[PDB]
Amino acid sequence: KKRPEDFKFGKILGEGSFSTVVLARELATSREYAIKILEKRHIIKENKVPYVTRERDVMSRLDHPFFVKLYFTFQDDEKLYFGLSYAKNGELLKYIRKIGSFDETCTRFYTAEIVSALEYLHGKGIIHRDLKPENILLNEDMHIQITDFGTAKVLSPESKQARANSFVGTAQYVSPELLTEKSACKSSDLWALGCIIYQLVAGLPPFRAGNEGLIFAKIIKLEYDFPEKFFPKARDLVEKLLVLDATKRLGCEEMEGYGPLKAHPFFESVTWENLHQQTPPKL
Numbered sequence: 001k002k003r004p005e006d007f008k009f010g011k012i013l014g015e016g017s018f019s020t021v022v023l024a025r026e027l028a029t030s031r032e033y034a035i036k037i038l039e040k041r042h043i044i045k046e047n048k049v050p051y052v053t054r055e056r057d058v059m060s061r062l063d064h065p066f067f068v069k070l071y072f073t074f075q076d077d078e079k080l081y082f083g084l085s086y087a088k089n090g091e092l093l094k095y096i097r098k099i100g101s102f103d104e105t106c107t108r109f110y111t112a113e114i115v116s117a118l119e120y121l122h123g124k125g126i127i128h129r130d131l132k133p134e135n136i137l138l139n140e141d142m143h144i145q146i147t148d149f150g151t152a153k154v155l156s157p158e159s160k161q162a163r164a165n166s167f168v169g170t171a172q173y174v175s176p177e178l179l180t181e182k183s184a185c186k187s188s189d190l191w192a193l194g195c196i197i198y199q200l201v202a203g204l205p206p207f208r209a210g211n212e213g214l215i216f217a218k219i220i221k222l223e224y225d226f227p228e229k230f231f232p233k234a235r236d237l238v239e240k241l242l243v244l245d246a247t248k249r250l251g252c253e254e255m256e257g258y259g260p261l262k263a264h265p266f267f268e269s270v271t272w273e274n275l276h277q278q279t280p281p282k283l
């Protein structure tokens with residue numbers, strides 16, 4: 001097991017409400033990692049332990065180019081340390097804010113990468129549940145690196161589990177079924193995907209309000225609209241994802257999965273097989 005003294009720590013990359021991510025260089029190899037550090041006392045005191053165990057368990061199952069990788073974990077008297085891959089280019093949200101609206105090529109490319117990632121994730125029977133641009137990081141090559149798995153759920157193949165009961169997520173991206181049926185499924189991530197596509201083109205996510213309760217009320221009534229100049233094929237895709245009935249979302253198991261989603265006309269130009277080796281278009 002690695003130890004804290006095996007690293008030179010640098011700048012804080014981010015601060016969560018129960019964790020801090022710090023850039024670190026491993027002394028023996030000179031490799032750079034993003035180390036998520038948690039204080040045991042705090043975690044135990046504020047019962048966030050379940051989030052911690054869940055994050056480690058889920059990330060340990062993932063081996064795919066479009067996800068942040070957990071290389072190692074270790075601990076000392078007071079803290080837990082997650083050694084994570086370093087996404088040098090930070091979060092996608094930063095680019096949306098700075099650019100305002102992605103062109104069609106960039107929207108399609110990044111959507112395709114997220115679709116690819118979700119296909120892998122859902123194929124392992126895992127629901128992310130907090131898919132959002134803040135949780136989609138970009139590596140030094142500008143490919144996506146999806147992160148934040150403390151709120152993810154590994155569904156049980158043994159009981160053919162399709163629904164999860166924990167109330168987690170971010171209001172803007174929360175699916176209607178979580179609000180009304182108090183449960184989430186793989187399809188809830190497809191809802192979030194629709195929200196993200198809309199946001200890439202529109203600049204803001206579809207269900208907008210100053211507070212959570214107002215957002216919740218709009219989500220359950222599907223109260224949103226498209227701005228002018230919304231790319232037609234993207235609009236068609238968004239409308240097939242932002243559907244109240246979770247069994248009717250393009251991409252979901254009841255709609256026969258990822259084949260039909262990847263076949264949507266929006267992705268007509270996409271070569272799915274080697275996305276992660278393609279040079280992403282310039283934002």
Ligand SMILES: Nc1ncnc2c1ncn2[C@@H]1O[C@H](COP(=O)(O)OP(=O)(O)OP(=O)(O)O)[C@@H](O)[C@H]1O
Pocket residue numbers: 013014015016017018019020021034036068084085086087088090091134137147148
């Ligand atoms: N692997 C990584 N590479 C680069 N930056 C990262 C990485 N993981 C997290 N970050 C940065 O750290 C910030 C917050 O990190 P962290 O996951 O500790 O908290 P959070 O999940 O955002 O908040 P909370 O603890 O409330 O869930 C993010 O905004 C992100 O920019």
Ligand SMILES: [Cl-]
Pocket residue numbers: 004009
């Ligand atoms: Cl430290």
Ligand SMILES: [Cl-]
Pocket residue numbers: 008009010011023024025
């Ligand atoms: Cl450093």
Ligand SMILES: [Cl-]
Pocket residue numbers: 031032033085
């Ligand atoms: Cl590395």
Ligand SMILES: [Cl-]
Pocket residue numbers: 060070071072073
């Ligand atoms: Cl590991």
Ligand SMILES: [Cl-]
Pocket residue numbers: 167168169170171174
């Ligand atoms: Cl919520």
Ligand SMILES: [Cl-]
Pocket residue numbers: 224225226
């Ligand atoms: Cl509409």
Ligand SMILES: [Cl-]
Pocket residue numbers: 232233236265
């Ligand atoms: Cl169309």
Ligand SMILES: [Cl-]
Pocket residue numbers: 272273
């Ligand atoms: Cl593929």
